[PDB]
Amino acid sequence: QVYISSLALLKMLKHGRAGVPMEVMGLMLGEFVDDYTVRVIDVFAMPQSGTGVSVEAVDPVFQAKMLDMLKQTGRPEMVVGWYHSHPGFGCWLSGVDINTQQSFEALSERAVAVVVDPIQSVKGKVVIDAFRLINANMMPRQTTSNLGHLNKPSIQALIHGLNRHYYSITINYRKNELEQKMLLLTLQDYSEHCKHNESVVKEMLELAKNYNKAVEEEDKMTPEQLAIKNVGKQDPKRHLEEHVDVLMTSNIVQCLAAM
Amino acid sequence: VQKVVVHPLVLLSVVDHFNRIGKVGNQKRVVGVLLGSWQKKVLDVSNSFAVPFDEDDKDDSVWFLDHDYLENMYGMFKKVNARERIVGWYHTGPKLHKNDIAINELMKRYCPNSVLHVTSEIGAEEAEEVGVEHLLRDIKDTTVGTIYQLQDVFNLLPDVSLQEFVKAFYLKTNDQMVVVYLASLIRSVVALHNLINNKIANRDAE
């Protein structure tokens, strides 16, 4: 349903992550065709107060004047709606609703905002969700059976009690091949080759002595998964595997390119 | 003086900007300024306007402005974030000429370092790669899951002189080969330990 250019996603994460928690805000720009398919191309970072920002961020001269400026040498069409930048927890909007819900119909019903999370999303899967005006009207969309993943939110009572008003739908994504593609020696005996095969073979010596002690010891009188893998005195044997792995990616490969 | 780092924030911004100006005609060196922290190695982290580029179509001897518009977006992003200073400016790929060095010089106003050349490094995207690693789906990063100068070029080429160097090269290879032989052994042993673990496991599951 709701679409994004994902430049709005990166400027979104930029403005959010830059200003935590401070709940930074802004408002994006796009176009409407039907019920709720909203292409969002650019988010507009409206400025920050001291520590608590509200409807006062809806300024005359900043969004009006700069909407004229990047209307001229940039994004031409009308705005969509706002956003909000929840740090930490996730998505529920208690004091946010009185500062956001009444603002929409001043413009249009074709107006969404979105709460994001640049703290708990360290991921490559960032928490994004728009919503509705279900302040009132408890009075269609076959969806293939209610869309799936909003019968799986973090089902928490204050969140789901917020979801009575909220009703998120989807977040689509676009990108192009160009952008995709874009994003996608030596050292020899300085001291290097010696002093990382003079090092690691010594831990292979006495760590293989402790591997000897491990195989001698656990051979008999062993039960219950070696007392839960020796959480204590970690860790024999695997250490040897790791050591073996470290040199054979190094003492060959760039040495190979030496040839 | 250090090099440049990168943030693909400005890369997606300029790429979307040439998705903007790509109407009928107008293959244009669209110059827009950057704002961000400038110090030792940086990127000038965020883009700006352009005052879009048109000369005649190729007669590139006439300019774009305002300096008050420089401090429109650069001035009123200070109301949003105050960490920034202009150095960076871009244009299209890949051709440059005296127009571009004349906007380095003529429209200078700070810009000591701004190549979009020794400052040549295309960065890491610190602390905001969450908006990159979500944007690195189908086909993935690797796959994830998988005359004077040229006169001085060949001054440092010739080496077949194997007496000394050859012997040395032979030797090092031998020593490192040995290391690998030593290793490729203890992982074979611990692999065999996993074999007897699996065989006694399924042997007891009989």
């Binding site: 054979m248 060959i252 190979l256 040839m259 | 290879t173 490729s184």
Partner: peptide
């Protein structure tokens, strides 16, 4: 030995 130089 570049041809000669299974581990994966």
């Amino acid at each position: 030995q570049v041809i000669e130089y299974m581990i994966v």
